[PDB]
Paper text:
Five members of the CLC family of Cl− channels and Cl−/H+ exchangers, ClC-3, ClC-4, ClC-5, ClC-6 and ClC-7, have critical roles in endosomes and lysosomes, catalyzing the exchange of two Cl− ions for one H+ ion2,10–12. To resolve the mechanism by which T9A and T9B regulate the activity of ClC-3, ClC-4 and ClC-5, we determined structures of ClC-3 alone and in complex with T9A, finding that T9A occludes the Cl− ion pathway and that inhibition requires the endolysosomal signaling lipid phosphatidylinositol 3,5-bisphosphate (PtdIns(3,5)P2). Each ClC-3 protomer comprises a cytosolic N-terminal domain (NTD), a transmembrane domain (TMD) and a cytosolic domain (CD).
Analysis of cryo-EM images of ClC-3 in complex with T9A revealed four classes that can be distinguished by the densities corresponding to T9A. Despite being coexpressed with T9A, we did not observe any densities corresponding to the T9A protomers in the fourth class, possibly because of T9A dissociation during purification. To distinguish this fourth class from the structure of ClC-3 determined in the absence of T9A, we call this class ClC-3/noT9A. A weaker density is also resolved in the same position in ClC-3/noT9A, suggesting that PtdIns(3,5)P2 may bind with lower occupancy when T9A is not stably bound.
Numbering used by the authors:
A (entry chain A), B (entry chain B): 78 to 174, 187 to 479, 495 to 737, 745 to 810
The structure:
């Protein structure tokens, strides 16, 4: 057809059936081309390998970017505490891997220990946090506004067919890559693991621009984006299987069979890239590499389930809190000052985090410490009480304070105009809760070994209880409660920790949290953010009442004027242009005759206008007076049959709306023409269905 | 409607849309019921938990049955070599865990070592193999003919909507459980891992009857069956994640999001049940628990890729060979003697297996030995050469003979009328090939360490090459080549071996095999067997030519007589009964009037006859003369509007058949009514689509 036909405007959903049709047509054209010449055969071979090439490129880019982001974030976070003068590039761990590393008090005051030294370290920590937060927020605001947030909700919307031009562009990729490091260094209650999914998706789109097959077709690009998201999760947690599971379960609306293996290969490639730079570019959580000698016991499930509950409860709170706060940001005036809000939040976070050791420590390092088990070699404060008796109260008090601080700050941190992730904060909260619960259980076992359960399961005076396992279970429970992921979450946690023996516990806790979350609402944080942003997302959970019928959702209805229709013949180009300008319809039905109202096809408004303009430019005399004939082949009438869709999806008025919604979800229909007695009556658009579902939810 | 309405006959596909509609109606009824009484609330709570209960029951039963089958198979297989008189229940390993265990030569001849002892052991081995094979085949033939084969192809067909009454019944479960042990003990080239999926599916189907929700609805039962298949794979390989991946990728036509977590929970429950009885009921492959000290090196990929190629090639051969042989069994007279064929095949297998040590050893134990690495503690013959220099030729010769014997015997073993699995033979062939390749690579490294690759990657005089990893890679490659599974296979292998370091190699090899297999055909062994059996399976790969249109596939066509249709009114019950008897159509369209040909609905033949008979019994005077009115409410006309489907799926004649196939696959439509100019013209049934695809394939 005319060039530009089939293209989609910004902020508009795609029609998956049409995309598959163009993909099939292009495949047929290439199949016929091969026989023509050997160069055509080579081009077809390249096209067949285009999927492998694009997924490999996306995985390589995701791994490299994840490594660079990890290294830069670690160095910048260590920069707050001090500086390694001997090796400026080296961070605190590398500097001491110490006299070379000097705290800011040593740099300025000259005294490593003292009230003035502590005060100066406090001010410098706050100043560095503020500087990093301000730089991040300014960079997002100036260059790439889309770089803010995790991006998982927008990726979910896009993979459902939605289009957000510039979200996965080069500008967003670069700005998000820099701002993730800046925000993580700032000490805000956020993580970079989730946003790596968006980073990988941006890389995948950029590489898809290279291959004509994926660039031309939106559905193919969305499969590439699903593979990219799998690779992003893999690099985030070193969980390629977990990444594939997340892609299938969370972000991929449609997950064909081949896309599974493509995503797995991309994730493995990205993980291998990270491993090649190991351990420089691998987060210490990704390199947890720790095991618990004592196998988990059946009675320990009861605490784990409890943790599960807590997780769910916390999620039920967080989804209710953050959303509300976010809604206020969208409704109140404080959302008009993103830079000021970010700076203030960073200031409060640093101010309350510096006094407490756990909060001051970087969140990923705190999660690592909590997951690590206690032992004679370990000198962590958490184990001090175990060394003292076998102060527990002081450690528990500090851990509870850190838990409360993290819980309160994550609500006000998620949603701000900087790249923020919820995975790391949720894992930290759950890990602190699990560490507290495990410490309590160990103390109960040691003090009350006379109990038959403790005596039978654990030998008298034996450290059967491992706080690290409890912390891992709590982190998984909190993540399940907030995100509502069930299997992908468990596999990701297992791959991050490497402990298969603890698969059964984790799952259990996760499920409990999920169920508890479902008690207060079946919508996850990502889904809630999708709804808050107003994106056109249709989900399987959403459903219509049985009484609802297609006639109810028909666009023309009663109050609205008669729906715009196009006669096949006897219509001028000026008439089509006037109809295009008058109405904002995604497309117009085309009928045999005005009186007959017999559906002939459905011509997209964009395609109609593009074809009319291209014909005007190509052929002289088309001043709008010439007629347009949608039928198959002086006036020189314009032919618009090519743009016309000859087999639009048709449903009856008496059809239940549940079947219509199922058709829309399975086939990804942009619109469906409701016809009565063989004649056109109305159109039900995905926008209309989404509007009706939103109205039902608001009720 | 009338009782029995909506039920499906045997060997008939189900309509997923209708199943979902009845599920929604039942859910609405229960939702309204809860408010009526507290007992209704408790019933609704039970119904909501019915999925968890059914999946838990399926997992428990699958784990218990897998453990029992493993124990019985191990004991029976050891029975062939000899007997433990001191403890008859104990097998060879348990007896020596030796003087207590006595070979049949000791029992009869009285001499443990001697030419007569070897001869007698040979005869007793053959006799036990024949006895077990005869008992297995007779048990399948007499009680449960469906117990034969792996059952994965039939489960694939069933999960696509097909109905095979009795396949998942109690008789099949019991007979298959006994016959799997009998066949595995017989020494035939088959495994019990794959068939365990069918066992789990039978357990799930049996348990579904307890819960009304799953028993009443076929689609719900099929989700339970998907969870059951995941649990079966989990027990087979101790790979719950691999089990879920297999369920999603191989057997589940539709995999809703909730079914993912349900399958994961069922698999974990079954694996935990196996672990509780550990190590008695766990196959030694499931308890491989072995690691390779030397990490895999990049150059070792080149052998692995080579192994991949071999795998694919072997698969391409096997699918072409076995199918052909299987086809001969269906076409020739030797398929009329299943007992004789089974006995003869067992005789040849035992005769050629006894002389060679690897073949005589049980296939699972041979796979374990091949996967295990060589070391000073190990006394295996495979490592003898390594001890001698560091006879290799003798070990390689024996391994090659075992490879050829297994490859030839698996072709004639798969498809016989006994429970047989392809997973274990495929892994055995691949493991033997990988062990040979790894031995060759190690010998090259030791002899030619001067090579820059070997010297750089491996220190001079260092055993960097690990034959166990090569054997694992070869097993994965062969399994990928024959089954064509990509991600589930890799995850299953990883969980079976427990080595996450070797995910990248495995995948690589698997990929190569798949690609190589795709060079000789894109249909796997299960798909090829589905096609051979003639089951009505529609796959995404199958597609129609662009020129094909709905009118081409319309049932009435030209030569065929006018399609049967039912007038809404003015028709007698005798007329409907006569139409039912005359035609074998799944259902009849109902129209406003004969002349108008305006589609009103679609009434299933089964529903029509059931409603007519039930009305005749319920109401007197219905002797066939009374008229039937399909319209909404002395003659006392019968009302058949309830059975009538008021919103049948309708498509246009000029529609491309590719869109029709996509609609059928996504929505699982039993039939689609092709209407032209608002009037009914024909029907395209899933049977018609499958027939057209089969015709295209035959060409
Ligand atoms: C070490 C630290 C780690 C850093 C991370 C490295 C990886 C990041 C990738 C590099 C990309 C680079 C960013 C180029 C901007 C771009 O390239 O920006 C396009 C507009 O000109 C321009 O270059 C403007 C450039 C003005 C001066 C640049 C100063 C340089 C700054 C200093 C640092 C640079 C160092 C990077 C090295 C690596 C517009 O292109 P975009 O940025 O792609 O945005 C839209 C989107 O792509 C849509 O895609 P979608 O439909 O798939 O969503 C399209 O459709 C739209 O097309 P349209 O132009 O027709 O509207 C398109 O604008
Ligand atoms: C230790 C060793 C390990 C062993 C493994 C244990 C687990 C196995 C489960 C136990 C089942 C037991 C098998 C009962 C037969 C059954 O129960 O057979 C139903 C027909 O009477 C009968 O009992 C016939 C019984 C004649 C005498 C039994 C002698 C006893 C033999 C000696 C050993 C017994 C020890 C077992 C203990 C455990 C017909 O029922 P079926 O066997 O279920 O076959 C069809 C299918 O279920 C369709 O299901 P689908 O639509 O989902 O495909 C339905 O729809 C059809 O219904 P219809 O009858 O209306 O046609 C239905 O016939
Ligand atoms: C267009 C995009 C996909 C290209 C991205 C290429 C990236 C992944 C490349 C560029 C430079 C590469 C690195 C260059 C050097 C080394 C040192 C070597 O001992 C291990 C691999 C390692 C660490 C490479 C890893 C992969 C790497 C980071
Ligand atoms: C926002 C981020 C990217 C900016 C990072 C810049 C950092 C590394 C810069 C900014 C200010 C710098 C310090 C400024 C002054 C001095 C005193 C000198 O005698 C030693 C180096 C030292 C202590 C510098 C170390 C590096 C430093 C901390
Ligand atoms: C209706 C179906 C699902 C019920 C199946 C129940 C099965 C799974 C039950 C019945 C008997 C049970 C066993 C009974 C005793 C023991 C010993 C204990 O130290 C470990 C668990 C173990 C080994 C149990 C495992 C589970 C088991 C095998
Ligand atoms: C098909 C399968 C299930 C049948 C299993 C039955 C097996 C275990 C039976 C059949 C024949 C039996 C043997 C027959 C005779 C004797 C001699 C006696 O002095 C010791 C026991 C011994 C050696 C028996 C051991 C058990 C035995 C091997
Ligand atoms: Cl994160
Ligand atoms: Cl996130
Ligand atoms: Cl098997
Ligand atoms: Cl099998």
């Amino acid at each position: 057809p005319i060039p530009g036909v089939g293209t989609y405007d910004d902020f508009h959903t795609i029609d998956w059936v049409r995309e598959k049709c163009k993909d099939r047509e292009r495949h047929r054209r290439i199949n016929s081309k091969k026989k023509e010449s050997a160069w055509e055969m080579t081009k077809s071979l390249y096209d067949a390998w285009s999927g492998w090439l694009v997924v490999t490129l996306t995985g390589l880019a995701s791994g490299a970017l994840a490594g660079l982001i990890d290294i830069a974030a670690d160095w910048m976070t260590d920069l707050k505490e001090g500086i390694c003068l001997s090796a400026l590039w080296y961070n605190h761990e590398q500097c001491c891997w110490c006299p070379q590393w000097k705290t800011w008090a040593e740099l300025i005051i000259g005294q490593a220990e003292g009230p003035g030294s502590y005060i100066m370290n406090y001010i410098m920590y706050i100043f560095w946090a503020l500087s990093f937060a301000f730089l991040a927020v300014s960079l997002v605001k100036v260059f790439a506004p889309y770089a803010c947030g995790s991006g998982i909700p927008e990726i979910k919307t896009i993979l459902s067919g939605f289009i957000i031009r510039g979200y996965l562009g080069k500008w967003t990729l670069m700005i998000k890559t820099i701002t993730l490091v800046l925000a993580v260094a700032s000490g805000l209650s956020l993580g970079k693991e989730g946003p790596l999914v968006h980073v990988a998706c941006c890389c995948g789109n950029i590489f898809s621009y290279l291959f004509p097959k994926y660039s031309t077709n939106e559905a193919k690009k969305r499969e590439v984006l699903s593979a990219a998201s799998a690779a992003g999760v893999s690099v985030a947690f070193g969980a390629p299987i977990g990444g594939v599971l997340f892609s299938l379960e969370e972000v991929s609306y449609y997950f064909p069979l081949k896309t599974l293996w493509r995503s797995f290969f991309a994730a493995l490639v990205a993980a291998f890239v990270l491993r090649s730079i190991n351990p420089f570019g691998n987060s210490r959580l990704v390199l947890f590499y720790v095991e618990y000698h004592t196998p988990w016991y059946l009675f320990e499930l009861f605490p784990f389930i409890l943790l599960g509950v807590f997780g769910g409860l916390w999620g039920a709170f967080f989804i209710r809190a953050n959303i509300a706060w976010c809604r206020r940001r969208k409704s109140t005036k404080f959302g008009k000052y993103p830079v000021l809000e970010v700076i203030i939040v960073a200031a409060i976070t640093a101010v309350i985090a510096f006094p407490n050791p756990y909060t001051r420590l970087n969140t990923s390092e705190l999660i690592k410490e909590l997951f690590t088990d206690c032992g004679p070699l370990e000198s962590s404060s958490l184990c001090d009480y175990r060394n003292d008796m076998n102060g527990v109260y002081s450690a528990i008090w500090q851990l509870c304070l850190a838990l409360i601080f993290k819980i309160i700050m994550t609500v006000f941190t998620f949603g701000i105009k900087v790249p923020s992730g919820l995975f790391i904060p949720s894992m930290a909260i759950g890990a602190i809760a699990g560490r507290i619960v495990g410490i309590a259980v160990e103390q109960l076992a040691y003090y009350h070994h006379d109990w038959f359960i403790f005596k039978e399961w654990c030998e008298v005076g034996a450290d059967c209880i491992t706080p690290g396992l409890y912390a891992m279970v709590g982190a998984a429970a909190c993540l399940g409660g907030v995100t509502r992921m069930t299997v992908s979450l468990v596999v990701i946690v297992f791959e991050l920790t490497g402990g298969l023996e603890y698969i059964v516990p984790l799952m259990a806790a996760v499920m409990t949290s999920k169920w508890v979350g479902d008690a207060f609402g079946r919508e996850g944080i990502y889904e809630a953010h999708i709804r808050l942003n107003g994106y056109p997302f249709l989900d399987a959970k959403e459903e219509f009442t049985h009484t609802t019928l297609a006639a109810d959702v028909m666009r023309p209805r009663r109050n609205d004027p008669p729906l715009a229709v196009l006669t096949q013949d006897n219509m001028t180009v000026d008439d089509i242009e006037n109809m295009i300008n008058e109405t904002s319809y995604n497309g117009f039905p085309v009928i045999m005759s005005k009186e007959s109202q017999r559906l002939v096809g459905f011509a997209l408004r964009r395609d109609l206008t593009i074809a009319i303009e291209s014909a005007r430019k190509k052929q002289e005399g088309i001043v709008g007076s010439s007629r347009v004939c949608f039928a198959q082949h002086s006036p020189r009438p314009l032919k618009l049959r090519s743009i016309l869709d000859m087999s639009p999806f048709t449903v009856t008025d008496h059809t239940p709306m549940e079947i219509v919604v199922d058709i829309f979800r399975k086939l990804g229909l942009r619109q469906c023409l409701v016809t009565h007695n063989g004649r056109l009556l109305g159109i039900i658009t995905k926008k209309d269905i989404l509007r009706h579902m939103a109205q039902t939810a608001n009720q």
